[PDB]
């Protein structure tokens, strides 16, 4: 009645989409990133801002592409990795130490990565604001709210890329068409 079907790899072997694995723009088949060529980085749990293109759908040749990702991002993928932590998490306590630990490694632009911090928390505060769809706030009694978590849970939310077989793998494509930041 209730077996979960596991998509497969070509390698035969399943796995999660949130445990290194990138979806093919092209053929939208799934990769491990070891089964992948040239792909060994370490990965976040729900980070998968990529965009990635097979040997089979790139004549040979593995593309692969690193967002440039926002505020939002880094939150929820801060929030995705810490709670699977024994309800909420304290933004001062939990969530700002982790940014500051990750902000070297996140692909974010230079004017994020080099920001002041009390710049940093007002645009944090401001940012889970203007999630609220995302993000729950908590408040402690006779507190000032600053306690944030997932409002579901599901992994980061990240834009689905789709090319035609013929279409050109350009920069320059992949922006005008899906509105996305590559990292230089
Ligand atoms: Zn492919
Ligand atoms: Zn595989």
Same mark, same amino acid.
């Given at each position: 009645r209730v077996n979960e079907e596991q998509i497969y790899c070509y390698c035969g072997k399943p796995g999660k989409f949130d445990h290194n694995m990138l979806q093919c723009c092209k053929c939208r088949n799934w990769?491990?990133?070891?089964?992948?060529?040239n792909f060994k980085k370490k990965l976040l749990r729900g980070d998968m801002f990529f965009?990635?293109?097979?040997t089979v759908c790139n004549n040979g040749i593995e593309f692969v592409? %690193?967002?440039q990702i926002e505020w939002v991002d880094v939150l929820?993928? $801060?929030? /995705?990795? @810490? *709670?699977?932590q024994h309800?909420? !998490?304290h933004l001062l306590n939990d969530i700002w130490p982790f940014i500051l630990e990750?902000?070297?490694?996140?692909?974010?632009?230079?004017?994020?990565?080099?920001?002041?911090?009390?710049?940093?928390?007002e645009r944090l505060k401001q940012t889970?604001?203007?999630?609220?769809? %995302?993000?729950?706030?908590?408040?402690?009694?006779?507190?000032?709210? $600053?306690? /944030?978590? @997932? *409002?579901?849970?599901?992994?980061? !939310?990240?834009?689905?890329?789709?090319?035609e077989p013929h279409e050109e793998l350009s920069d320059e494509l992949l922006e005008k068409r899906f509105?996305?930041?590559?990292m230089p």
């Open positions: 990769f491990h990133t070891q089964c992948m060529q965009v990635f293109c097979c592409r %690193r967002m929820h993928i $801060a929030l /995705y990795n @810490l *709670r699977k309800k909420y !998490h990750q902000r070297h490694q996140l692909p974010i632009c230079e004017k994020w990565r080099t920001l002041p911090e009390t710049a940093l928390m889970l604001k203007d999630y609220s769809d %995302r993000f729950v706030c908590g408040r402690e009694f006779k507190r000032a709210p $600053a306690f /944030y978590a @997932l *409002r579901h849970s599901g992994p980061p !939310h990240i834009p689905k890329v789709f090319l509105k996305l930041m590559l």
